[PDB]
Write a protein that binds this ligand. Structure first.
Ligand SMILES: Nc1nc2c(ncn2[C@@H]2O[C@H](COP(=O)(O)OP(=O)(O)OP(=O)(O)O)[C@@H](O)[C@H]2O)c(=O)[nH]1
Ligand SMILES: [Mg+2]
Length: 168
């Protein structure tokens, strides 16, 4: 096919803004007014230049986090979303991130980090989120961190463009 099919796995803690950011990737008439917490996971297909993303929108709730690893084997890229305003759980985000990295089915595929909710005045800056998560230690793998506002889409294209370049 003329469109390259790639699997994009979207993870991160509950309430980080995963589902909301994916809505920004859909055609405007297809975007949802409101989103609720994800139950288990759902799937979306989004066209992006020459690529067709099969998006695995995982719940970030603790009861569903064991589902994430069922989709590492076939993931071609990862979008790890973080609530920039949630300083308290950065260390939890980090723990889940490391379990993902160490998993024997996760290959060395690109990771896009969204520092989501940049609009909130309590938002930690991307550089500090990078420090809390230990991202500079990730040397075997392309990665990038971009601040985003999932409500407006600000930063979303910038992050996705970087990811698309990596998968083309
Ligand atoms: N202020 C602000 N709110 C946001 C932003 N992104 C998402 N939200 C809001 O944050 C809440 C959580 O967003 P979701 O997209 O449901 O988060 P999620 O990561 O998919 O949550 P789970 O499915 O439970 O894992 C929703 O009320 C969103 O409207 C943002 O960038 N800024
Ligand atoms: Mg969700």
């Amino acid at each position: 096919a003329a469109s390259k099919k790639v699997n994009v796995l979207v993870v991160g803690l509950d309430n980080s803004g995963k589902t909301t950011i994916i809505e920004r990737l859909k055609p405007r008439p297809r975007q949802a007014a409101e989103v609720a917490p994800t139950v288990g996971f759902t799937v979306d297909e989004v066209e992006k230049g020459p690529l067709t993303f099969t998006v695995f929108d995982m719940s970030g709730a603790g009861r569903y986090r064991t589902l994430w690893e069922q989709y590492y084997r076939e993931a071609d890229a990862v979008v790890f979303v973080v609530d920039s305003a949630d300083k308290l759980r950065m260390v939890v985000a980090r723990d889940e991130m490391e379990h993902m990295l160490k998993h024997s089915n996760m290959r060395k595929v690109p990771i896009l980090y969204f520092a989501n909710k940049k609009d909130l005045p309590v938002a930690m800056p991307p550089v500090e989120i990078a420090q809390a998560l230990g991202l500079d230690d990730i040397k075997d793998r392309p990665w990038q961190i971009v601040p985003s506002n999932g409500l407006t889409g600000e930063g979303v294209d910038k992050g996705i463009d970087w990811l698309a370049e990596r998968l083309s």
